[PDB]
Amino acid sequence: ADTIVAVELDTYPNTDIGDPSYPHIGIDIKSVRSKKTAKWNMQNGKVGTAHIIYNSVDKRLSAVVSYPNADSATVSYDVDLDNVLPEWVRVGLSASTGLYKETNTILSWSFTSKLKSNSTHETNALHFMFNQFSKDQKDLILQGDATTGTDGNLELTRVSSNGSPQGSSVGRALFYAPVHIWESSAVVASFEATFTFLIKSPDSHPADGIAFFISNIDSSIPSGSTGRLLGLFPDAN
């Protein structure tokens, strides 16, 4: 299986597999059984403002999720990405639905890494700022049943029957270019993101959650990940 680390914005409560009793933010290390969880308000179709940092000088993997006039979902778990995730990786978005409906529309996504030639020897980058996901964006390897375009949006669902998001569908948004990590040139790459989303209510008690993974450079939708496995993990342990 592909070694994969995500920050799950899960919306279906799974006290079966370690998701808490409430719709939560979660931080996954090679398992859907997460490390930290936090209560999240989860307003309806509104805007998005999520954020991820991992500064190896502080070695925390923090995150927030902010609506307007809401609060931050601090889910900072202490994990070292030295040994738990491969040398060259492939960041991207993951979304899913199953037996319910919920909207998985991304409106903008960004990134910035800064990785240590010899710390003050002019660290590298892979910054990008996709605010305007177009129709034929050919630097994305969107897998699954994910689509793009039709507005400035990233529609990570089979959609548009009045947007009614067509349950049991999986969508991924793998970015095209790799990122050097392992430690090896040490791992101070404070890789930032911004994860603006719009989880609109279909009036259905909406629940299956969006993610933000960091996979291996080779991946797929492994053997069925529609549902509580949430788009990227093969196994529920």
Q: Name the site residues for its own copies (rule: CB under 8 A).
A: 88, 108, 116-118, 121-132, 134, 137-139, 152, 176-180, 185, 217
Cβ proximity to its own copies: between 126 and 236 the closer is 126
Cβ proximity to Zn ion: between 25 and 85 the closer is 25
Place of tokens 């999520």: 50
Does 12 belong to an annotated binding site?
A: yes
- Report the amino acid identity of residue 116: K
Q: Give the CA distances from residue 177 to residues 52, 183, 217, in Å, rounded to whole numbers and listed in that order.
A: 19, 19, 9
Q: How far is the CB of 12 from its own copies (least distance, A)?
A: 31
According to CB under 5 A, which one of 5, 7, 9, 12 is a site residue for Ca ion?
12
Using an 8 Å Cβ cutoff, are 50 and 210 in contact? no
DSSP state of 144: B
Q: How far is the CB of 94 from its own copies (least distance, A)?
A: 20
Of these partners, Zn ion, Ca ion, its own copies, none, which one is at the site of residue 26 (CB under 5 to 8 Å by kind)? Zn ion
Encode 97-121: b = buried (16+ Cβ within 10 Å), e = exposed: bbebbbbbbbbbbebbbbbbeeeee
Cβ proximity to its own copies: between 38 and 179 the closer is 179
Cβ-based neighbour number of residue 75 at 10 Å: 24
Residue nearest to Zn ion (CB): 10
Which range touches Ca ion (CB under 5 A), out of 95-103, 132-140, 152-160, 223-231? 223-231
Of these partners, Ca ion, its own copies, Zn ion, none, which one is at the site of residue 12 (CB under 5 to 8 Å by kind)? Ca ion
**How far apart are the C-alpha atoms of 174 and 59, rounded to whole Å?**
25
